Amino acid sequence: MAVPPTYADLGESARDVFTKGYGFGLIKLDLKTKSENGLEFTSSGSANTETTKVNGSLETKYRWTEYGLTFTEKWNTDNTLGTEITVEDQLARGLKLTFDSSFSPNTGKKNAKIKTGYKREHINLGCDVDFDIAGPSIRGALVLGYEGWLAGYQMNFETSKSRVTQSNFAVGYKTDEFQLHTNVNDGTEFGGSIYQKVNKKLETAVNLAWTAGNSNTRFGIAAKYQVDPDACFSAKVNNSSLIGLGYTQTLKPGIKLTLSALLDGKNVNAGGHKLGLGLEFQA
Amino acid sequence: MAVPPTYADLGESARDVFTKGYGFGLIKLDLKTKSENGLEFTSSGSANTETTKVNGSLETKYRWTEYGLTFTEKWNTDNTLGTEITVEDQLARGLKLTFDSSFSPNTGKKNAKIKTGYKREHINLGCDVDFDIAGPSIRGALVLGYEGWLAGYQMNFETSKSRVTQSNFAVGYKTDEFQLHTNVNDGTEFGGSIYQKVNKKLETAVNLAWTAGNSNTRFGIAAKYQVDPDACFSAKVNNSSLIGLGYTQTLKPGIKLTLSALLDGKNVNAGGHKLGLGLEFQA
């Protein structure tokens, strides 16, 4: 409806067409459960094919939807630990508060974060305070919506240098079938994307990017074809001659396999082409 | 050395040749981590190919080896929850105490268990008290060792019927290369097995079983060939004409795939042959 996305979510759909259905040079094992009320868990195994380094993630999550509450514990294989409490729609509809705690016993270094979001018709506001060692930093964002139009600002203030270190503007238009998104970062990096839901089975995206000091231009084109409900193909090219190819199949209910190939241009089937395999398991 | 196994462990090796390297009619996803001191986790996803029912297990484990302590939390997709505290070698070398707690919110039904084991040269004693609803039951076991010989007794007393409900004897001989194991259950079921470590690459087993009231006989033969350190083949037959075939490959370090086939005899490649796929991920 008329409640705009967060700054970060501006351009998500186009990004989603380019990123999801590919995991080049990785073998991924995902185990998730679904409990809309109560206890949930996500375990993830990742193996880099070029390095053979193997990562492991567990996330434990209690949703208490009566109280708009979510508690999340996370663990990785570097022994880094994470707590996240989230209150949503409690003191007021569209308000969201998150207290987030981090601790790597590997380094002894902590990290706490308080994130606030307020959201209503035409406006999406955020303020994120990172209480870092060499912090805090505060990241604030405002998105305003006008009849499918979206204008955004995002800034980051590092108290150590007592200065703004990031200043991003975004402008866009957004129906369900079509999204224009444009952004400039630090008055220097230019981005734009078009996402089109061409029909129920085909998503396409175009991506543009360039720098204020530099006459060259980066672009990609991307497509996602949902052949049937249990299979989909994804392909992308960029003007650096890279080709991405992606196939996701549901083998059995709750079991999805993804095969990925990233090919280099001209030297196609003549050298260093990354492959990927993802297996997702839903219970 | 001269410290014998537990009653349950009598015949493990032979059982291991018959069971490991096969998972017929199942798709399994295992994610484990290794931390000999501290935090460990095992997540398991199982899909029955014939039913398409999908099971999910998480196990969380802190080992505190300074104190011989292990805490384990477990969860399954039926919402059943489990705690296990374990003290080993603390008040005395070879003593092991376990307090184990269960609770299915699905049924509201609890289950607590206290298990004690004492172990030393020539003897392996256990007493397990299941504090069940329609319990308790106490299961006690004694294994005695004499120069490779092993004699065992195992009983179960249900306090509700105030009677012994199980009474098992086992006799065996056991070097590292070779195990004879024989057992009679409730004076009626007869079991025996031979395990031979024929060399560093080949394990074989033979299995026999029959009933005091019944002139028929069940047997299986089983082999496990370790071709190289990253591949192994397993095959078994039984006198009911079933054939098991198993291949386990290490694809990348920490990633192991198992393909299983269970074939019916005479009707081989002419009907209902179960297949299996296991993927194990170590991080």
Beta bridge partners of B170: B152, B183
- Please name the residues between 11 and 40 in chain A that touch chain B, using a CB distance below 8 Å: 27, 29, 31, 33, 35, 38-39
Q: Are residues B279 and A282, on separate chains, in Cβ contact within 8 Å?
A: no
CA B196 to chain centre: 19
Amino acid at A166: Q
Contact A280, A46 (CB under 8 A): no
Token pair, residue A201, equals 């089975």
- Please name the residues between 47 and 86 in chain A that touch chain B, using a CB distance below 8 Å: 47, 49, 52, 54-56, 58, 60, 75, 77, 79
Q: Name the nearest CA neighbour of A149 among A169, A124, A168, A174.
A: A174
Question: B52: which chain A residues are within 8 Å (Cβ-Cβ)?
Answer: 252-254
Q: Does residue A117 sit at the B interface (CB-CB below 8 Å)?
A: no
Name the strand (E) or helix (H) holding A243. Answer: strand A243-252
**DSSP 3-state of A240:** coil
Token pair, residue B154, equals 């195992």
Residue with tokens 């009320």: A37
Beta bridge partners of B120: B123
Q: Are residues B283 and A77, on separate chains, in Cβ contact within 8 Å?
A: yes
Beta bridge partners of B97: B87, B116
Residue B21: CB atoms within 10 A of its CB come to: 23
Q: Where are the alpha helices (DSSP H) in chain A?
A: 12-19
CA distance B45 to chain A (A): 7
Q: Does residue B265 sit at the A interface (CB-CB below 8 Å)?
A: no
Beta bridge partners of A46: A28, A55
Rounded Cα distance, B43 and B220, in Å = 32
Question: A56: which chain B residues are within 8 Å (Cβ-Cβ)?
Answer: 31, 33, 41, 281, 283
**DSSP 3-state of A265:** coil
Residue A41: CB atoms within 10 A of its CB come to: 22
A207 Cβ neighbours under 8 A, 6+ residues apart: A14, A18, A191, A192, A193, A218, A219, A220, A221, A222, A238
Q: Are strands B137-146 and B149-158 parallel, antiparallel or unpaired?
A: antiparallel
Nearest to A47 among B41, B58, B255 (CB): B255
Q: Are residues A54 and B29, on separate chains, in Cβ contact within 8 Å?
A: no
DSSP per residue, A166-189: EEEEEEEEE-SSEEEEEEEETTTE
Q: Are residues A38 and B79, on separate chains, in Cβ contact within 8 Å?
A: yes
Residue with tokens 């912090």: A135
Rounded Cα distance, A251 and B69, in Å = 42
B106 φ, ψ to 5°? -50, -50
Cα distances (Å, whole numbers) of residue A223 to A15, A266, B218: 11, 21, 59
Token pair, residue B196, equals 């031979």
Q: Are residues A43 and B31, on separate chains, in Cβ contact within 8 Å?
A: yes
Contact A149, A5 (CB under 8 A): no
B246 Cβ neighbours under 8 A, 6+ residues apart: B21, B22, B233, B234, B235, B258, B259, B260
Contact B104, B87 (CB under 8 A): no
Q: Are residues B31 and A47, on separate chains, in Cβ contact within 8 Å?
A: no
Nearest to B45 among A79, A251, A283 (CB): A283
Contact B232, B226 (CB under 8 A): yes
Contact B269, B245 (CB under 8 A): no
Q: Are strands A26-32 and A274-282 parallel, antiparallel or unpaired?
A: parallel
Beta bridge partners of A170: A152, A183
A17 φ, ψ to 5°? -65, -40
Q: Is A212 left (phi over 0), alpha (psi -120 to 50) or beta?
A: alpha
DSSP per residue, chain B: --SPPPTTTTTHHHHHHHHTT--TTEEEEEEE---SSEEEEEEEEEEETTT--EEEEEEEEEEETTTTEEEEEEEETT--EEEEEEEESSSSTTEEEEEEEEEETTTTEEEEEEEEEEEETTEEEEEEEEE-TT--EEEEEEEEEETTEEEEEEEEEETTTTEEEEEEEEEEEE-SSEEEEEEEETTTEEEEEEEEE-SSSEEEEEEEEEETT----EEEEEEEEEEETTEEEEEEEETTS-EEEEEEEEEETTEEEEEEEEE-SSSTTSS--EEEEEEEEE-
